[PDB]
Amino acid sequence: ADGQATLLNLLLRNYLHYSLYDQAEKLVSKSVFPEQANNNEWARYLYYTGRIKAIQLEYSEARRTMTNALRKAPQHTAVGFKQTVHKLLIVVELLLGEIPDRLQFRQPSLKRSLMPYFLLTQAVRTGNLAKFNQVLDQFGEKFQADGTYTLIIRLRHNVIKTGVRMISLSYSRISLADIAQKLQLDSPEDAEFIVAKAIRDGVIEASINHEKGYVQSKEMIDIYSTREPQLAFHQRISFCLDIHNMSVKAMRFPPKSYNKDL
Amino acid sequence: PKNPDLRIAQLRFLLSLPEHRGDAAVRDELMAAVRDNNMAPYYEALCKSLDWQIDVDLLNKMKKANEDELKRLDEELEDAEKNLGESEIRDAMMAKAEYLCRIGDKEGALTAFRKTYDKTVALGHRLDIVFYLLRIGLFYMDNDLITRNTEKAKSLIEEGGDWDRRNRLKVYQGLYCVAIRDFKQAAELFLDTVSTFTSYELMDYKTFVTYTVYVSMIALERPDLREKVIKGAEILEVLHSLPAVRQYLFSLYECRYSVFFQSLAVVEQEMKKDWLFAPHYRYYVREMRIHAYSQLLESYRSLTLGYMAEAFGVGVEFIDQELSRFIAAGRLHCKIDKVNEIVETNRPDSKNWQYQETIKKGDLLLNRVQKLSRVINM
Amino acid sequence: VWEDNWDDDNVEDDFSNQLRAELEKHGYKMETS
Amino acid sequence: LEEGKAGSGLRQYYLSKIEELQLIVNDKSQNLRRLQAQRNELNAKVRLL
Amino acid sequence: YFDYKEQLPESAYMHQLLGLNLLFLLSQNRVAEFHTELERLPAKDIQTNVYIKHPVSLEQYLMEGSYNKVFLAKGNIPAESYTFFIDILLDTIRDEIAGCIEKAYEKILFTEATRILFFNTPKKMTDYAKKRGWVLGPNNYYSFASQQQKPEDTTIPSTELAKQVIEYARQLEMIV
Amino acid sequence: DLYSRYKKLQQELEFLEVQEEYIKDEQKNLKKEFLHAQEEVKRIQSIPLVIGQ
């Protein structure tokens, strides 16, 4: 259905500006999806379904498939049209705390298009509430005048989540004055609460202490080296030998598929 | 080209961005503009220059002198043509290409160096043409055009490395290897500095040492310096030119930060405002700070804030965020200790991690053999 | 090499707002801090 | 009726899938017996030695 | 509500009944269905009433963990008659918030529990004494059975390693 | 003929399936004989010997 798919591109584009209903095209528009590439329909169509799937803050799927869609369609133009999918790309990339800037692309279009969003898209990493809250609305015209300010009004409350995620990738234990005052949040309640929510995840460990009022911590985050190694990488040995073992099957069966005819 | 117009026209970087030093650069640029047919370079870069009052005065003379020398080189080229000879036509077209490099036009010099590039009787003359494209490629700061002729003309030498020809190509390797951030392979290039000499074509000897002292001082560790430069008499002879380099070498090797931080402002100011060395000034600073922190922190397991604050001569509030950003971002050592306001690390990176250095190649190799499974039947 | 541009762009761009160089300020921060 | 063409049709298709499993056993016997002839040819070669 | 024909006009109480549905899902610890349900609700029907953005802001405050904003924001709800239902929500999440804040990893002092916990009414100190079943010291809460588990004797993992070796001879040598 | 191909084919199913453990026996035994004869022809090479040119 090539022509029907091209009609679906203009119908979905007509549903792009203001439809916001997901009862039919979501879970009903999904079809068998035959071979419909056109060498451009992946870029524009994947950009369309990614713009539709950009309201629920997709972190895993739309990232890889929309970045790949940005890597697609190099025939005619990859600069004048990819600036918007790159704009929304970095906009949805800075939500995860790690925002990759323009590194491998050198063109004088994404630079000028990204100049107003540059200072803030770098300001997300540090995560300053009071200053950057005024910096955004200070000169903010286009990125906040894009419409309904939904993702940016959610970003204003996502600064603390990207900041506490930067703390998750940073040191684990939390202090009462140094890092609590550094993060502009002096409250021992939600500090120990969120840190406890990071302890129950299982990826890290921490502790709490109260002697004279300050929160102490042994901050022993030493790796499993010389600390129960057999139980540490036992499942690593079993799993690696299972994958490499089925890889041995994957190097024993193709020889059978070779000698099968002779 | 090989004339001083490469350096005089190369000072346009410090002539353009900073407004304080834009007086001497326009002084010797305007004064030296009557040399080497500097009309087209400063006319193209006229936006970063003065008004058009005195500009249109000499243009009428340079535009007719360019046509006079051009038609004289055309007459000499026509006189050398239709005659039995190889070096005469190569010297005529080669000289015309040299003048077209003096004016700064790579179109007629592109087709000229293409014709004389096809008339190369030997491979050495061809490599000389390659160098003639590199001397202007430094000014044009192109990336692939300077690596194509050297990648193709690099192999099939069969005549051995000369004293300043192969060493000159090694100097070019220092140029494009200092431009790029590749250091582990560029630390071996400047080993042949004994055979180097004062070459006014591209870079002076003092400028070559001044440029290699950064990649050698930062891109090398203590054993590499003690083996390469400290054991060698090169820096021992050339240290008497500038007494500052001896301070930045004996201070870094001696681990004295009290004079290193007080005198580091000269390295910060001198590091920028350069043609090819300015855009990379941020990598040498961070790399040198993390290199010094790994140097002092290597032989020191636990470190109190007193000996550290008195040793570095800076407040604790700054090194706190320094180590805070360089433990996660830099990834130099393990978790830091702050229970008694004393930096105390463990660094178990030898016993178990020495065997765990292959787990990265095991996971990437695991995905690669999964791709090998993807190649099966398809 | 574009691999190093992630860290160089991380610290370089991170310091683009304030305290870009900071090396010239240590000479004034020695006596005050 | 509509059984020999539908019931015996899907049963005959399942019998074709059984013929596919017997094709996996078949060509496994083929390549296993050719490799068996290779090892038998090498051991017979050192027997000739 | 979920129909193919879009000709059905949207009722004024549709967002209210869906608000009670989100209240039930968040009350029954089904916040995952809320996370996967946040896709269909942003239809931008009103977007100016506090009740439209109330469930997402209260759930986002629940993810942030700031409980003082909810208590101080209790008087911000309008005369809408679901304030008692919000109190029921606090009654069904007080066990999760109070249960997570009183995990007692190493030790916690009562001077903080006076602020985090509810008023001086002895409901938590009575119900939690028969629910958690811990010891009551001199105006302090002690924590036992914390990181006290003894490591293995390396006997069972050696047996399962032997069985794994048997499986290695099996799978590595099965066709032979 | 049409319906008899199933039950008649079952004889080929058993005749071809019975060869599995057989080819297992051959591939597990002929390599044991391969190392037997391999070590028998390998042990012929003795240390005491004469050196020629």
Side-chain angles (χ1 to χ4, degrees):
Chain A
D2 195 1
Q4 186 177 2
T6 59
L7 293 174
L8 193 143
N9 293 117
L10 57 93
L11 286 175
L12 199 147
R13 185 181 63 84
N14 197 3
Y15 289 164
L16 192 143
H17 66 281
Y18 172 70
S19 288
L20 277 79
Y21 69 95
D22 291 331
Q23 63 267 14
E25 80 262 21
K26 299 298 290 184
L27 295 175
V28 173
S29 73
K30 272 75 178 174
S31 297
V32 188
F33 290 163
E35 294 178 353
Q36 297 170 354
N38 202 3
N39 298 114
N40 199 359
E41 190 178 0
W42 284 99
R44 58 177 64 189
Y45 176 74
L46 208 153
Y47 169 73
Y48 289 164
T49 187
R51 181 66 179 87
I52 300 299
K53 288 188 287 184
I55 195 166
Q56 71 271 18
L57 278 76
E58 184 68 28
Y59 292 164
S60 179
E61 197 271 335
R63 170 66 172 83
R64 56 179 176 88
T65 197
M66 188 170 70
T67 306
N68 194 1
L70 188 142
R71 291 188 181 97
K72 292 293 188 291
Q75 293 85 17
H76 194 271
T77 48
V79 171
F81 185 75
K82 299 295 187 291
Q83 63 182 357
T84 305
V85 68
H86 184 80
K87 182 176 173 66
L88 185 63
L89 178 65
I90 55 97
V91 164
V92 305
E93 278 174 353
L94 61 92
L95 299 175
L96 281 79
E98 294 293 328
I99 170 64
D101 291 331
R102 183 184 62 83
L103 271 70
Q104 64 183 357
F105 288 164
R106 184 180 64 84
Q107 58 267 14
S109 296
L110 276 68
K111 291 176 69 68
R112 293 182 180 92
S113 296
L114 203 137
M115 282 180 184
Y117 208 81
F118 183 75
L119 184 62
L120 68 97
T121 201
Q122 182 50 247
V124 171
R125 290 179 181 174
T126 58
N128 196 357
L129 294 174
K131 295 293 183 182
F132 296 156
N133 195 2
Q134 188 62 255
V135 171
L136 289 173
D137 203 4
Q138 183 67 41
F139 65 95
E141 193 271 332
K142 184 175 175 67
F143 60 91
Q144 75 177 1
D146 199 3
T148 66
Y149 54 87
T150 55
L151 193 55
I152 186 169
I153 209 66
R154 291 184 179 94
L155 180 59
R156 292 179 66 250
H157 290 171
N158 201 2
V159 172
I160 191 65
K161 188 167 76 68
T162 60
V164 74
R165 184 173 292 172
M166 189 65 204
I167 300 300
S168 71
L169 293 175
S170 179
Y171 306 107
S172 179
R173 310 297 176 96
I174 185 163
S175 179
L176 193 142
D178 291 331
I179 196 166
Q181 187 177 2
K182 182 175 71 68
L183 291 173
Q184 291 87 20
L185 192 145
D186 48 354
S187 178
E189 297 86 4
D190 56 355
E192 195 270 331
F193 191 78
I194 292 169
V195 166
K197 291 291 181 288
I199 298 165
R200 68 178 293 275
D201 291 331
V203 296
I204 47 95
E205 193 178 2
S207 177
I208 304 97
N209 284 315
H210 286 89
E211 181 67 28
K212 64 178 71 66
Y214 289 164
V215 176
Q216 291 85 18
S217 66
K218 65 182 181 293
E219 59 189 357
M220 185 179 288
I221 320 173
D222 187 73
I223 57 175
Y224 60 91
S225 296
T226 68
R227 183 68 178 172
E228 294 292 328
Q230 298 85 22
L231 195 142
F233 57 87
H234 183 272
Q235 63 183 357
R236 176 65 180 171
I237 294 174
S238 67
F239 287 164
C240 80
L241 282 172
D242 286 331
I243 300 299
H244 292 90
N245 196 357
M246 69 180 288
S247 296
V248 169
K249 302 294 183 182
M251 71 169 282
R252 286 180 181 177
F253 184 75
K256 268 74 176 175
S257 296
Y258 158 70
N259 204 2
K260 63 180 285 184
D261 58 355
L262 56 94
Chain B
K2 64 182 181 293
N3 290 318
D5 190 74
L6 182 65
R7 292 188 296 272
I8 301 299
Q10 192 178 2
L11 298 176
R12 65 182 294 275
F13 186 79
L14 54 92
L15 187 145
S16 177
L17 277 76
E19 295 293 328
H20 295 285
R21 293 181 184 271
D23 54 355
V26 77
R27 181 66 178 87
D28 62 357
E29 176 67 28
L30 183 63
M31 183 179 72
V34 301
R35 293 180 180 91
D36 296 328
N37 197 0
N38 203 2
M39 177 182 174
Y42 96 99
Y43 181 75
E44 184 178 1
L46 190 59
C47 183
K48 264 63 186 298
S49 296
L50 277 76
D51 291 331
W52 295 352
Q53 297 294 321
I54 204 167
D55 181 74
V56 298
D57 290 331
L58 278 76
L59 291 176
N60 291 318
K61 183 174 72 68
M62 296 300 290
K63 75 180 180 67
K64 68 180 179 67
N66 193 0
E67 185 68 28
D68 287 331
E69 184 68 28
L70 192 142
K71 72 181 182 180
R72 287 180 67 249
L73 290 174
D74 287 333
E75 182 68 28
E76 183 67 28
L77 182 63
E78 291 179 353
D79 289 331
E81 200 178 1
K82 273 77 176 175
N83 290 318
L84 183 62
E86 294 292 328
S87 296
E88 184 178 1
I89 300 169
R90 192 190 183 281
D91 286 332
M93 185 66 74
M94 184 181 72
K96 181 178 182 291
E98 287 179 353
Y99 188 74
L100 289 171
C101 288
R102 290 180 180 91
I103 189 63
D105 291 331
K106 295 182 291 295
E107 291 85 4
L110 193 144
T111 183
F113 279 114
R114 185 179 67 189
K115 292 296 289 183
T116 194
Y117 182 79
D118 291 331
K119 294 191 291 292
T120 57
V121 65
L123 55 93
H125 298 173
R126 183 179 296 113
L127 186 61
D128 291 331
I129 297 299
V130 171
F131 177 74
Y132 290 164
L133 270 73
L134 297 178
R135 63 184 182 178
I136 195 165
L138 179 63
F139 180 75
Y140 191 67
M141 68 179 288
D142 45 357
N143 296 115
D144 199 3
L145 294 174
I146 59 167
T147 59
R148 180 65 65 193
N149 54 4
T150 59
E151 184 178 1
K152 186 180 289 293
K154 183 178 184 292
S155 66
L156 295 174
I157 297 170
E158 294 292 328
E159 68 183 1
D162 292 334
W163 190 258
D164 204 4
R165 178 179 60 84
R166 180 66 180 87
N167 195 3
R168 183 66 59 84
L169 184 62
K170 185 67 69 178
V171 172
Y172 165 71
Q173 289 181 357
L175 263 66
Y176 94 96
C177 282
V178 159
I180 203 167
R181 292 187 299 273
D182 182 74
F183 288 162
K184 296 183 289 294
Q185 295 297 110
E188 197 69 26
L189 303 178
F190 61 92
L191 187 64
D192 58 354
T193 186
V194 179
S195 65
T196 57
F197 193 70
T198 300
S199 179
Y200 61 93
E201 296 179 353
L202 295 175
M203 287 178 183
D204 196 0
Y205 183 76
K206 62 182 181 180
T207 63
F208 182 75
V209 176
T210 308
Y211 287 165
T212 194
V213 75
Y214 291 101
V215 63
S216 68
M217 184 174 69
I218 285 93
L220 275 73
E221 59 183 1
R222 295 192 70 188
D224 289 332
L225 295 174
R226 185 178 181 270
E227 182 68 27
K228 288 184 181 179
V229 295
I230 296 173
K231 187 183 287 185
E234 299 88 4
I235 194 67
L236 296 172
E237 286 181 351
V238 307
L239 64 86
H240 294 88
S241 178
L242 294 174
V245 178
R246 187 178 65 246
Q247 294 179 356
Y248 294 113
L249 289 175
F250 286 166
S251 67
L252 182 63
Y253 185 77
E254 199 176 1
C255 192
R256 288 185 181 272
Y257 296 99
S258 296
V259 68
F260 176 72
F261 286 164
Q262 182 66 41
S263 65
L264 192 59
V266 180
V267 178
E268 177 65 28
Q269 293 179 356
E270 190 178 1
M271 186 179 288
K272 64 182 180 180
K273 297 184 291 294
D274 198 358
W275 178 256
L276 194 62
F277 196 73
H280 295 284
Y281 81 104
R282 292 296 301 271
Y283 186 76
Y284 291 97
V285 173
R286 185 190 68 187
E287 184 68 28
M288 194 174 186
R289 292 293 297 273
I290 195 167
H291 182 74
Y293 288 164
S294 66
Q295 179 180 0
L296 187 141
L297 194 60
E298 182 67 28
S299 176
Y300 288 159
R301 191 181 67 248
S302 179
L303 286 170
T304 186
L305 293 173
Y307 183 75
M308 185 180 288
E310 291 293 327
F312 288 99
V314 77
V316 181
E317 69 271 15
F318 198 73
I319 58 172
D320 194 1
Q321 64 182 357
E322 276 185 348
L323 295 174
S324 178
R325 292 168 294 180
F326 276 102
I327 286 296
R331 193 178 181 270
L332 45 92
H333 282 83
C334 65
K335 175 63 185 289
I336 196 169
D337 195 1
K338 205 182 287 185
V339 296
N340 295 115
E341 293 179 353
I342 292 169
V343 173
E344 182 179 1
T345 188
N346 195 1
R347 199 255 187 188
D349 291 331
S350 296
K351 298 293 187 291
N352 195 2
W353 185 258
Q354 188 175 1
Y355 288 97
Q356 288 178 356
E357 286 180 353
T358 61
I359 197 167
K360 294 182 183 293
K361 300 293 183 182
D363 290 330
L364 196 145
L365 192 144
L366 193 144
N367 197 2
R368 192 173 295 276
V369 301
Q370 283 182 354
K371 180 67 174 66
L372 178 63
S373 179
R374 187 181 295 274
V375 184
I376 303 300
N377 290 318
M378 185 178 288
Chain C
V1 176
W2 290 271
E3 192 271 331
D4 192 76
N5 286 318
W6 180 63
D7 290 330
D8 196 2
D9 199 4
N10 193 1
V11 176
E12 192 272 332
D13 196 4
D14 197 2
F15 290 165
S16 65
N17 193 1
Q18 290 294 111
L19 48 95
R20 182 180 63 84
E22 196 64 27
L23 271 75
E24 294 178 354
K25 193 175 179 180
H26 285 89
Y28 290 163
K29 289 174 71 175
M30 286 180 184
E31 68 271 15
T32 61
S33 296
Chain D
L1 194 63
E2 293 292 328
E3 198 274 333
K5 299 293 178 68
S8 179
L10 62 92
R11 186 176 176 87
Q12 185 65 43
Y13 290 163
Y14 181 75
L15 179 57
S16 68
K17 292 188 286 185
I18 297 299
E19 290 180 353
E20 292 179 353
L21 271 73
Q22 295 295 321
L23 185 62
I24 300 169
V25 178
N26 194 1
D27 64 357
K28 276 195 291 185
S29 67
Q30 291 179 356
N31 54 25
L32 260 66
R33 84 167 62 95
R34 290 295 296 163
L35 183 63
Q36 194 68 252
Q38 183 177 2
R39 294 290 186 269
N40 197 2
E41 194 271 331
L42 185 60
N43 199 0
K45 184 177 184 293
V46 301
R47 167 65 67 186
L48 292 174
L49 184 63
Chain E
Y1 289 163
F2 183 75
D3 195 0
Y4 290 163
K5 293 182 183 293
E6 293 179 353
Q7 293 179 356
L8 294 174
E10 293 179 353
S11 179
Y13 290 165
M14 183 179 72
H15 294 285
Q16 187 175 3
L17 184 61
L18 267 71
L20 290 175
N21 194 1
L22 298 179
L23 182 64
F24 181 75
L25 293 176
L26 198 146
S27 296
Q28 293 298 109
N29 201 0
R30 293 180 181 177
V31 76
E33 293 180 354
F34 184 77
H35 286 90
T36 195
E37 204 267 332
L38 282 170
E39 187 177 2
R40 66 183 68 187
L41 59 91
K44 195 169 75 175
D45 290 331
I46 295 96
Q47 289 293 321
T48 195
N49 194 0
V50 71
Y51 188 76
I52 302 299
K53 200 174 72 68
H54 187 273
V56 293
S57 296
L58 185 61
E59 191 269 331
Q60 188 175 4
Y61 290 163
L62 183 63
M63 293 188 288
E64 290 179 353
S66 179
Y67 186 75
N68 290 318
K69 184 69 176 177
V70 178
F71 182 75
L72 293 174
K74 186 259 289 181
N76 201 4
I77 289 95
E80 202 266 326
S81 179
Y82 286 172
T83 303
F84 183 75
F85 288 97
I86 300 299
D87 291 331
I88 296 169
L89 182 63
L90 294 174
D91 199 3
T92 195
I93 70 170
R94 61 179 290 167
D95 56 354
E96 293 292 328
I97 301 299
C100 289
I101 200 67
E102 293 292 328
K103 189 69 175 177
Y105 277 159
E106 292 292 328
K107 62 184 176 66
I108 46 98
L109 211 145
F110 186 73
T111 190
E112 290 88 5
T114 307
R115 291 180 179 90
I116 282 98
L117 293 179
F118 286 168
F119 290 163
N120 55 3
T121 304
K123 295 294 188 291
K124 290 182 179 179
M125 65 180 288
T126 301
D127 186 74
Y128 289 164
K130 299 294 187 291
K131 184 177 179 180
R132 295 290 184 183
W134 290 350
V135 294
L136 181 62
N139 198 0
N140 193 359
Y141 290 164
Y142 290 164
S143 178
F144 61 94
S146 296
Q147 294 179 357
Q148 201 177 2
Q149 295 297 109
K150 182 174 73 175
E152 294 293 327
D153 204 3
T154 67
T155 61
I156 298 169
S158 66
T159 59
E160 75 183 1
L161 276 172
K163 293 181 181 179
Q164 284 181 355
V165 170
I166 297 168
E167 293 179 353
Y168 294 159
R170 172 180 169 87
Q171 293 180 356
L172 284 174
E173 290 85 4
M174 172 57 75
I175 293 96
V176 182
Chain F
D1 291 331
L2 196 274
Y3 191 76
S4 177
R5 189 167 63 190
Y6 175 76
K7 190 179 286 185
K8 179 68 176 177
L9 187 63
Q10 293 294 321
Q11 184 178 2
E12 187 174 0
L13 266 70
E14 293 180 353
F15 186 78
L16 187 61
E17 194 270 331
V18 77
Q19 301 295 319
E20 287 291 327
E21 201 270 334
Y22 166 67
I23 197 66
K24 291 285 187 291
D25 288 332
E26 277 189 347
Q27 72 180 359
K28 78 185 289 184
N29 289 318
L30 268 74
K31 61 167 65 180
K32 293 193 289 289
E33 293 179 353
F34 179 74
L35 59 92
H36 271 288
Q38 183 66 41
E39 288 183 352
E40 283 179 353
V41 303
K42 181 67 174 66
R43 71 188 298 273
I44 300 298
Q45 296 178 356
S46 296
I47 292 94
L49 52 90
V50 68
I51 297 95
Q53 62 183 357

